[PDB]
Design a protein around this ligand. Structure first.
Ligand SMILES: *C(=O)[C@@H]1[C@H](NS(=O)(=O)O)CCN1C(=O)N[C@@H]1CCCNCC1
Ligand SMILES: [Cl-]
Length: 360
């Protein structure tokens, strides 16, 4: 009965949403009572007929920021940087710019003062162009006052964390972070030998879409991973004490909240809600206006532990993919939902909520 009921619950949550959003392929992984459960739907490629499995690689877009935050957590708990460091401490090229007056925490939590959603189209994947972009940028409002969700903000945070460790971001992720987490199906640059696992992404008129190079792409949206590997990462987040101490501390650093906007408490990468909360409130926290408009923050008197009766989550999208991850620390419960269409955040949350409600 238990296996039957779980399948029935996940199918009932997933199937209508896949149909309604014309999603070609979708992978679910759930961590429940210390065991993984996988549910795979549809096609990784409509053209060659490759089916989705728990090993299929999907682009996870901004969910990558939780990995970036974990690397920063490592730099922090290793005393190579502090959250109150000024940004220009870690890149001489930024000395004399406005980044003299902007903290690493500001960058990590999108409060540097109006860094935009994405780098402008004019900025290519080039160190000099990126350097010059930040050198010339001026805040719209005071650092530390308003949240504006931003790839160049947290991207710079990750880049500076790598500089503080004296190695390239991409190399640190491949050689240190992914292996520490036990992740062998997680990539910034998918090996040739693994390309058979890489799903096709689909956009308007089902044009094929896989993510191309861009400035600070690794830091902001670099990761391709499987539902199985992403759940392994969720399980590391649920039980950081199962990892060697330096990495346990790194994961813990991503479970600390610094301010609230409405119902959401902002950590490094992760965004947290009280649990239970209504589906409509969780959707609102993951909505377009939340991502696209500046919001005044309510700063906390001290960092808050993001644990117990809370839901931690992150959305992420590329042109052809849409990902969502959510977990409840106090219930040892986690889930990932990966798809090869960028479909509305509210629909991803709707699937997750149906699964979580059914388990409760
Ligand atoms: C991350 O996925 C961010 C936004 N995250 S969310 O939490 O608002 O969903 C959605 C889109 N996004 C991107 O990183 N988009 C990039 C834009 C750079 C160029 N193309 C790659 C996609
Ligand atoms: Cl960007």
């Amino acid at each position: 009965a238990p296996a039957d009921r779980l399948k029935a619950l996940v199918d009932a949550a997933v199937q209508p949403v896949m149909k309604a959003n014309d999603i070609p392929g979708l992978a679910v992984a759930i961590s429940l009572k210390g065991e993984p459960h996988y549910f795979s739907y549809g096609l990784a490629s409509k053209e060659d007929g490759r089916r989705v499995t728990p090993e299929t690689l999907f682009e996870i877009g901004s969910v990558s920021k939780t990995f970036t935050a974990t690397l920063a957590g490592y730099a922090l708990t290793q005393d190579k940087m502090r959250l109150d460091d000024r940004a220009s401490q870690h890149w001489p090229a930024l000395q004399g710019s406005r980044f003299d007056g902007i903290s690493l925490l500001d960058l990590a939590t999108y409060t540097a003062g109006g860094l935009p959603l994405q780098f402008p189209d004019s900025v290519q994947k080039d160190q000099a162009q990126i350097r010059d972009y930040y050198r010339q940028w001026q805040p719209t409002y005071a650092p530390g006052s308003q949240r504006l969700y931003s790839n160049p903000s947290i991207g710079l945070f990750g880049y500076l964390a790598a500089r503080s460790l004296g190695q390239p971001f991409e190399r640190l992720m491949e050689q240190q972070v992914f292996p520490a987490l036990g992740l062998e199906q997680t990539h910034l640059d998918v090996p040739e030998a693994a390309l058979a696992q890489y799903a096709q992404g689909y956009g308007k008129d089902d044009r094929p879409l896989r993510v191309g190079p861009g400035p600070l792409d690794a830091e902001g949206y670099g990761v391709k991973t499987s539902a199985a590997d992403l759940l392994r990462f969720v399980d590391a987040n649920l039980h950081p004490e199962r990892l060697d101490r330096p990495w346990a501390q790194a994961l813990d650093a991503t479970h600390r909240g610094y301010y609230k906007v409405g119902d959401m408490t902002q950590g490094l990468g992760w965004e947290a809600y009280d649990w239970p909360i209504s589906l409509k409130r969780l959707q609102a926290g993951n909505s377009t206006p939340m991502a696209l408009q500046p919001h005044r923050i309510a700063r906390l008197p001290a960092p808050q532990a993001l644990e117990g009766q809370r839901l931690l989550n992150k959305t992420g999208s590329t042109n052809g993919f849409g990902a969502y991850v959510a977990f409840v620390p106090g219930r040892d419960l986690g889930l990932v939902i990966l798809a090869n269409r960028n479909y509305p955040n509210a629909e991803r949350v709707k699937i997750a909520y149906a699964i979580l409600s059914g388990l409760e």
